[PDB]
DNA sequence: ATCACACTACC
DNA sequence: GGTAGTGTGAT
């Protein structure tokens, strides 16, 4: 085993210069440094460790270093270099699995300050290196009387960079060992810094293998990108911006502008008693002025106080203004925030009723405005706006944290491609259509690619069936794939309209509340608890399951975590959401091992992964994947293979509920819904 | 004896009137406004022959104040034949007003 | 429930 | 140019 790390002139996307690298070899206990002209040797050293069936440790190497070295090797030495997946270990991938109850700065992309909870020390150090390095640089240049520029700290190799480089392997090596000391994932019997690659995956918890395969495949996905119809969204932006203007005009008329105190420095005191009056707006006492002998054109008279004010124009985006104008129309807020302030979400706006008809009608305009702005914000004006993220290759390379969630789910960001508006919401067709394989023209034939969207069928219920099989012998599972589980649940709970039950179940799984539960049939908010009692009464297995999970955790805890399908620990925040954590984590790991197995099976069939190949992973949104295919035939194969792999996953974990998938072929995300 | 204005009666009551008209742009929440208020009743009564005092509550009449760049209240505007002759901001005193008036009238 | 991110209001 | 509060977008 060897721990390594490199310094280059940029992010993967545009890197062109390999500044330096460092390798720590366990077999010799030494640190060898490689400067600019040692690049060929650096690469030889890594392939050497591969020839001996070794292992190479990097921190965030799966997303950066390995793909980077491939690219830099082809550009600077006209050499082909491809570290095999099975030979690489990523300590970042490892921390996210082991310290899953914690966050991280995504290697510096997120501000530590904004992150909640504590942070693993070594990892924080590693992610702050680019920032610290930039600090020493910027600090040192100024001591030399030179202006600092954007990111010049990375343009040329220097010794401060080499020192930081060595530091990284030092910390990475420490972090690595800290992680290997966790007996839950790595047996104490074995010394994992002294085994071949095939033993390392073999003797460690199944989860280590899965997360590494998941990070590797997903690193590929980010590189693939999701073909995006820029022109389409710009035309949509013009439309949206127009409807926004018109909505502002009609609204800035129905609701006139007003005045508000602002700029007041001194405190207003009763002119008679001096009694400070903080309730009164802050004032300002001019220190000069006077009525004058030439008249004094100036408008202030010393000692004569006034409340400085500003002119505020109604802004439909401000929930405050909205709350101000509607109460002024006779609206009596019912539910306030748990911090002194009326609630103004689409739900309440929906329930507001005022005398003036024009006002009542403006409320819908306000709701439309809020939605329009939501779309504009997400597609064009926001920081992480799609239009601000599309690259030269015409694709959006959204970031994905293979294990950024406690349950084992991934998190997506920059921009979150797991939150594109659905086809069922306003403008969801256009948004969704702008993301598609059709927007990618083949590098050879110039022909549009085709898309394959595959969705794991009712995974949450199947995961529930599975876990209650211990108590009902597969009764629920059997009913799912043969009867009408939705009807069965419709009869369990009362809820008229055996379709309200579907609303009920998915609600019952994703938290929900008595109010919203009863809000399915009618008003019966908290009174709806009665309904959430009849169900669990007519479905004793779910009750048995909950009781058993409790016995596992509570006793003050006996254990603060749950065991996922691959053995890993899954932190349980509150005993109340334990069943939920279990279910989400199951679905999560099932879909992870699934998209992993799918790509492996596609590759074993001959198909190549890439735009220069046959298929390309574009996105993975929890229970679904969207795959770009060069031809319909290939698209048909991916769909068939996604089904085989799902069955394989079910078998692999002796699942007590048959698992399935459904796929649709089409030009984009809209049609593949 | 003070003219209580509105946005719609402004042009005709102030701009299209004979004589000097002193307008007070005020608000219920302002402190200095509530202060210079009593002073105005007297002033309106004293200069009852060579001046008219008019109040405009900017919350009920949100359209007029903006046309004059009001940036603080109370704002006193002196109009002569539909134009702003003199202008002073702040709760002046019974005597400071008298000066401002006598000096500008 | 789990998570990203936008727009207002304030220092 | 940041933090807090309130919300919506999705699985
Ligand atoms: Mg690194």
Residues in chain B: 105
Pairwise CA distance, residues B98 & A173, whole Å: 84
Q: What is the fold of A458-558?
A: DNA polymerase; domain 1 (1.10.150)
3-state secondary structure of A56: strand
Pairwise CA distance, residues B94 & A470, whole Å: 90
Query: Cis bond leading into A415, ω under 30°?
Result: yes
CATH code: domain A227-394 is: 1.20.1060.10
CA distance B91 to chain A (A): 5
Assess contact for A430 and A232: CB atoms under 8 A. yes
Pairwise CA distance, residues A492 & A485, whole Å: 10
DSSP assignment of A569-627: EEE-S-GGGHHHHHHHHHHHHHHHHHHHHHHHHHHTTT--BSTTSSEEEEEE-SSEEEE
Instruction: Report the sign of the C-alpha dihedral through residues A235, A236, A239, A241, in that order.
Output: negative
Domain spans of chain B, in order of start:
1-105
CA distance B70 to chain A (A): 8
| Number of Cβ atoms within 10 Å of the Cβ of A260 | 13
Pairwise CA distance, residues A399 & A410, whole Å: 10
Domain spans of chain A, in order of start:
1-226, 227-394, 395-457+559-673, 458-558
Pairwise CA distance, residues A322 & A596, whole Å: 49
Q: Across the strands, what pairs with A43?
A: none
Q: Which of A299, A265, A257 is nearest to A282 (CA)?
A: A265
Of the candidates A281, A286, A295, the beta carbon closest to that of B90 is on: A286
- Tell me: is residue A5 an annotated ligand-binding position: yes
Residues 6+ apart with CB under 8 A from A473: none
Pairwise CA distance, residues A582 & A587, whole Å: 9
Assess contact for A451 and A665: CB atoms under 8 A. yes
Assess contact for A661 and A643: CB atoms under 8 A. yes
- Is the CB of A323 less than 7 A from some atom of nucleic acid strand C? no
Longest alpha-carbon distance in chain A: 103
Query: Cis bond leading into A19, ω under 30°?
Result: no
CA atoms in the 13 A half-sphere facing the CB of A172: 30
Region of A329 on the Ramachandran plot (φ > 0 left; ψ -120 to 50 alpha; else beta):
alpha
Pairwise CA distance, residues A164 & A197, whole Å: 28
Q: Which residues of B touch A (CB under 8 A)?
A: 27, 29-33, 35, 58-59, 62-63, 65-66, 70-75, 86-93, 96, 99-100, 103-104
Pairwise CA distance, residues A333 & A57, whole Å: 58
3-state secondary structure of A194: coil
Q: In what order do the strands lie in the sheet with A661-666?
A: A615-620, A624-629, A450-456, A661-666
Assess contact for A549 and A577: CB atoms under 8 A. no
Assess contact for A314 and A257: CB atoms under 8 A. yes
- Tell me: is residue A135 an annotated ligand-binding position: no
Is domain B1-105 in CATH 3.40.50.300, yes or no? no
Pairwise CA distance, residues A519 & A200, whole Å: 52
- CA-derived radius of gyration, chain B: 12
| Number of Cβ atoms within 10 Å of the Cβ of B49 | 6
Pairwise CA distance, residues A204 & A390, whole Å: 40
Residues 6+ apart with CB under 8 A from A257: A311, A312, A313, A314, B62, B66
| Dihedral angle, C-alpha A539, A540, A541, A543, nearest 10 ° | 110
Pairwise CA distance, residues A162 & A514, whole Å: 59
Resolution in angstroms, to 1 decimal, for this deposition?
Answer: 2.7
Pairwise CA distance, residues A88 & A212, whole Å: 8
A146 burial via Cβ count (<10 Å: 0-12, 13-18, 19+): exposed
H, E, C per residue of A397-424: CCEEECCCCCCCCCEEECCCCCCCCCCC
DSSP code, position A306 = B
CA A418 to C1' D10, in angstroms, rounded, equals: 6
| Number of Cβ atoms within 10 Å of the Cβ of A343 | 14
Q: Which pair of tokens denotes residue A37?
A: 């002209």
Helices marked H in A101-186: 121-142, 159-180
After which residues is the backbone of chain A broken at C–N > 2.5 Å?
A: 292, 555
At A493, give phi and psi (nearest 5°). -80, 165
Assess contact for A539 and A377: CB atoms under 8 A. no
- Give how far the C-alpha of residue B6 lies from the chain's centroid of Cα atoms, to the nearest Å: 13
Residues 6+ apart with CB under 8 A from A526: A514, A515, A518
A334 burial via Cβ count (<10 Å: 0-12, 13-18, 19+): exposed
Assess contact for A372 and A379: CB atoms under 8 A. no
CA atoms in the 13 A half-sphere facing the CB of A478: 5
Chain B residues within an 8 Å CB radius of A291: 88, 96, 99-100, 103
At A628, give phi and psi (nearest 5°). -80, 135
Pairwise CA distance, residues A310 & A89, whole Å: 60
DSSP code, position A308 = E
Q: Which of B102, B80, B100 is nearest to B88 (CA)?
A: B100
Between CA A627 and CA A630, with CA A628 as vertex, the angle to 5 degrees is: 140
3-state secondary structure of A639: helix
CA A342 to C1' D5, in angstroms, rounded, equals: 12
Q: Which of B14, B21, B23, B33 is catalytic?
A: B33
Q: In what order do the strands lie in the sheet with A88-90?
A: A30-34, A18-25, A2-8, A56-58, A88-90
Pairwise CA distance, residues A517 & A511, whole Å: 10
Assess contact for A205 and A55: CB atoms under 8 A. no
Longest alpha-carbon distance in chain B: 32
The CATH classification of domain A395-457+559-673, taken from the options 3.30.465.10, 3.30.1050.10, 3.50.50.60, 3.30.70.370 = 3.30.70.370
Pairwise CA distance, residues A633 & A640, whole Å: 11
Q: How far apart are the first and last CA of chain B?
A: 19
Pairwise CA distance, residues A16 & A9, whole Å: 7
Q: Across the strands, what pairs with A562?
A: A570
Q: Which of A279, A374, A358, A371 is nearest to A326 (CA)?
A: A358
Residue in the structure block whose two tokens are 């295919």 = A629
| Dihedral angle, C-alpha A30, A35, A37, A43, nearest 10 ° | 50
Distances from the Cα of A561 to the Cα of A195, A570, A642, angstroms: 30, 5, 31
Beta strand pairing status for A561-563 and A569-571? antiparallel
Residues 6+ apart with CB under 8 A from A540: A471, A472
Q: Which pair of tokens denotes residue B86?
A: 């003199």
Q: Which pair of tokens denotes residue A613?
A: 């190949």
- Tell me: is residue A25 an annotated ligand-binding position: no
CA A318 to C1' C9, in angstroms, rounded, equals: 9
Pairwise CA distance, residues A136 & A140, whole Å: 6
- Is the CB of A388 less than 7 A from some atom of nucleic acid strand C? no
DSSP assignment of A506-575: HHHHS---HHHHHTTTSS-SGGGGGHHHHHHHH-HHHHHHHHHHHHHHB--BS-SEEE-TTS-EEE-S-G
Chain A residues within an 8 Å CB radius of B74: 306
After which residues is the backbone of chain B broken at C–N > 2.5 Å?
A: none
Distances from the Cα of A658 to the Cα of A210, A335, A462, A463, A581, angstroms: 22, 45, 8, 10, 21
Pairwise CA distance, residues A402 & A125, whole Å: 21
Q: Which pair of tokens denotes residue A463?
A: 């995961």
DSSP code, position A63 = I
Pairwise CA distance, residues B27 & B56, whole Å: 8
Pairwise CA distance, residues A490 & A47, whole Å: 61
What angle, rounded to 10 degrees, do the helices at B31-46 and B94-104 form? 60
DSSP assignment of A221-275: HHHH-EEB-HHHHHHHHHHHHHHHHHHHHHHHHHS--EEEE-S--BPPB-TTT--
Pairwise CA distance, residues A11 & A31, whole Å: 25
Residues 6+ apart with CB under 8 A from A87: A49, A50, A54, A55, A56, A197
Query: Cis bond leading into A500, ω under 30°?
Result: no
The CATH classification of domain A1-226, taken from the options 3.40.50.300, 3.30.420.10, 3.20.20.70, 3.30.70.60 = 3.30.420.10
Q: Across the strands, what pairs with B72?
A: A308
Beta strand pairing status for A56-58 and A88-90? parallel
Assess contact for A311 and A257: CB atoms under 8 A. yes
Q: Which of A641, A628, A647, A650 is nearest to A602 (CA)?
A: A641
Pairwise CA distance, residues A100 & A406, whole Å: 5
H, E, C per residue of A313-372: CCCCCCHHHHHHHHHCCCCCCCCECCCCCECCCHHHHHHCCCCCHHHHHHHHHHHHHHHH
Query: Who surrounds ion ligand 1 at CB < 5 A?
Result: A 5
Residue in the structure block whose two tokens are 């009564």 = B45
DSSP code, position A658 = -
Residues 6+ apart with CB under 8 A from A273: none
Q: Which pair of tokens denotes residue A148?
A: 């600092």
Q: Which of A289, A71, A92, A283 is nearest to A175 (CA)?
A: A92
Q: Which pair of tokens denotes residue B84?
A: 């702003």
Assess contact for A240 and A434: CB atoms under 8 A. no
Pairwise CA distance, residues A164 & A133, whole Å: 7
| Dihedral angle, C-alpha A256, A261, A263, A266, nearest 10 ° | 170
Assess contact for A283 and A264: CB atoms under 8 A. yes
Between CA B27 and CA B37, with CA B32 as vertex, the angle to 5 degrees is: 70
At B25, give phi and psi (nearest 5°). -90, 115
Beta strand pairing status for A88-90 and A18-25? unpaired
DSSP code, position A85 = G
- Tell me: is residue A455 an annotated ligand-binding position: yes
Q: Chains A, B: CB contacts under 8 A, how many?
A: 90
- Give how far the C-alpha of residue A23 lies from the chain's centroid of Cα atoms, to the nearest Å: 33
Q: Which pair of tokens denotes residue A134?
A: 């930039």
Q: Which of A559, A551, A549 is nearest to A581 (CA)?
A: A549
Between CA A571 and CA A577, with CA A576 as vertex, the angle to 5 degrees is: 50
Q: Which of A110, A129, A117, A9 is nearest to A414 (CA)?
A: A110
- CA-derived radius of gyration, chain A: 30
Pairwise CA distance, residues B103 & B105, whole Å: 6
Pairwise CA distance, residues A88 & B87, whole Å: 78
3-state secondary structure of A58: strand
| Number of Cβ atoms within 10 Å of the Cβ of A304 | 23
Residues 6+ apart with CB under 8 A from A388: A380, A382
- Give how far the C-alpha of residue A173 lies from the chain's centroid of Cα atoms, to the nearest Å: 28
Q: Which of B70, B42, B45 is nearest to B58 (CA)?
A: B70
User: Burial code of A261-291, b = ≥16 C-beta within 10 A, e = fewer?
Assistant: beebeeebbeeeeeeeeeebbbbbebeebeb
Pairwise CA distance, residues A133 & A153, whole Å: 8
At A239, give phi and psi (nearest 5°). -60, -55
Chain B residues within an 8 Å CB radius of A299: 87-89
Q: Which of A365, A495, A492, A379 is nearest to A428 (CA)?
A: A379
Pairwise CA distance, residues A217 & A627, whole Å: 13
The DSSP element (H or E) to which A310 belongs, if any, is strand A307-312
């Amino acid at each position: 085993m060897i721990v390594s790390d490199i310094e280059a002139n940029a992010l993967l996307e545009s890197v062109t210069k390999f500044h330096c690298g460092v390798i720590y070899d366990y077999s010799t206990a030494e640190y060898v440094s490689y400067r600019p002209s040692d690049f060929g040797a650096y690469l030889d050293a890594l392939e050497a460790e591969v020839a001996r069936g070794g292992l190479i440790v990097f921190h965030n190497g799966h997303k950066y270093d390995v793909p980077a070295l491939t690219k830099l090797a082809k550009l600077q030495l006209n050499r082909e270099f491809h570290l095999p997946r099975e030979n690489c270990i990523d300590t970042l991938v490892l921390s996210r699995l082991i310290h899953s109850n914690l966050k991280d700065t995504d290697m510096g992309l997120l501000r530590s300050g904004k992150l909640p909870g504590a942070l693993e020390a070594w990892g924080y150090r590693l992610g702050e290196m680019k920032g610290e390095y930039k600090d020493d640089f910027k600090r040192m240049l100024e001591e030399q009387g030179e202006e600092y520029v954007d990111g010049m700290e990375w343009w040329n190799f220097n010794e401060e960079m080499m020192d930081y480089n060595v530091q990284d392997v030092v910390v990475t090596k420490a972090l690595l060992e800290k992680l290997l000391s966790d007996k839950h994932y790595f047996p104490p019997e074995i010394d994992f810094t002294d085994v071949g690659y095939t033993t390392f995956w073999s003797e460690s918890l199944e989860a280590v293998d899965i997360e590494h395969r998941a990070a590797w495949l997903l690193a590929k996905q980010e590189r693939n990108g999701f073909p995006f119809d820029t022109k389409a969204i710009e035309e949509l932006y013009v439309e949206l911006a127009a409807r926004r203007s018109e909505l502002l005009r009609k609204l800035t008329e129905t609701f006139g502008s007003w005045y508000q105190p602002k700029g007041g420095t001194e405190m207003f005191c009763h002119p008679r008693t001096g009694k400070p009056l903080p309730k009164y707006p802050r004032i300002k006492t001019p220190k000069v002025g006077g009525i004058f002998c030439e008249l004094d054109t100036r408008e202030y008279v010393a000692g004569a106080p006034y409340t400085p004010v500003e002119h505020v124009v109604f802004n439909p985006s401000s929930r405050d203004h909205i709350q101000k104008k509607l109460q002024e129309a006779g609206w009596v807020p019912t539910k306030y925030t748990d911090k002194g302030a009326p609630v103004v979400d689409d739900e309440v706006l929906e329930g507001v009723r005022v005398d003036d008809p024009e006002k009542q009608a403006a409320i819908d305009l306000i709701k439309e405005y809020l939605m329009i702005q939501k779309r504009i914000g997400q597609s064009a004006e926001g920081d992480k706006a799609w239009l601000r993220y599309v690259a030269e290759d015409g694709k959006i390379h959204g970031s994905v944290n293979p294990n950024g969630a406690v349950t084992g789910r991934a998190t997506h960001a920059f921009p979150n491609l797991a939150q594109i508006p659905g086809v069922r919401s306003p403008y969801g067709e256009q948004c969704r259509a702008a993301f598609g394989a059709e927007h990618h023209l083949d590098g050879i034939t110039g022909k549009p690619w085709v898309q394959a969207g595959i969705d794991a069928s009712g995974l949450e219920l199947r995961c529930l069936a599975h876990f209650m099989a211990r108590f009902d012998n597969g009764e629920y599972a059997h009913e799912i794939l043969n009867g009408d589980i939705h009807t069965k649940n419709q009869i369990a709970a009362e809820l008229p309209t055996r379709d309200n039950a579907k609303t009920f179940i998915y609600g019952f799984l994703y938290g929900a509340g008595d109010e919203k539960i009863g809000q399915i049939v009618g008003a019966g908010k908290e009174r709806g608890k009665e309904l959430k009692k009849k169900f669990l009464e007519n479905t004793p297995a779910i009750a048995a399951l909950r009781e058993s999970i409790q016995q596992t955790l509570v006793e003050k805890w006996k254990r603060r975590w749950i065991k996922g399908l691959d053995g890993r620990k899954v932190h349980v925040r509150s005993p109340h959401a334990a069943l939920n954590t279990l279910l989400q984590s199951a679905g999560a790991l099932i879909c992870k091992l699934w998209i992993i197995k799918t790509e492996e099976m596609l590759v074993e069939k001959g198909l190549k992964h890439g735009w220069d190949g046959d298929f390309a992973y574009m996105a993975w949104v929890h229970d679904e994947i969207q795959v770009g295919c060069r031809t319909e035939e290939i698209a048909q194969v991916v769909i068939e293979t996604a089904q085989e792999a799902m069955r394989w996953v079910g078998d692999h974990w002796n699942f007590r509920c048959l698992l399935d998938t459904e796929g649709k072929m089409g030009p984009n995300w809209a049609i593949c819904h | 004896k003070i003219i209580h204005l509105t946005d719609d009666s402004f042009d005709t009551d102030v701009l299209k009137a004979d004589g000097a008209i002193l307008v007070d742009f005020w608000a219920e929440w302002c402190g200095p406004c509530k202060m210079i208020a009593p002073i105005l009743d007297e002033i309106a009564d004293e200069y009852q022959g060579k001046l008219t005092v008019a109040k405009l509550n900017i919350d009920q009449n949100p359209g007029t104040a903006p046309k004059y760049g009001i940036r603080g209240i109370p704002t006193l505007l002196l109009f002569k034949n539909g134009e702003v002759a003199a202008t002073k901001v702040g709760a002046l005193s019974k005597g400071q007003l008298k000066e401002f008036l006598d000096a500008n009238l």
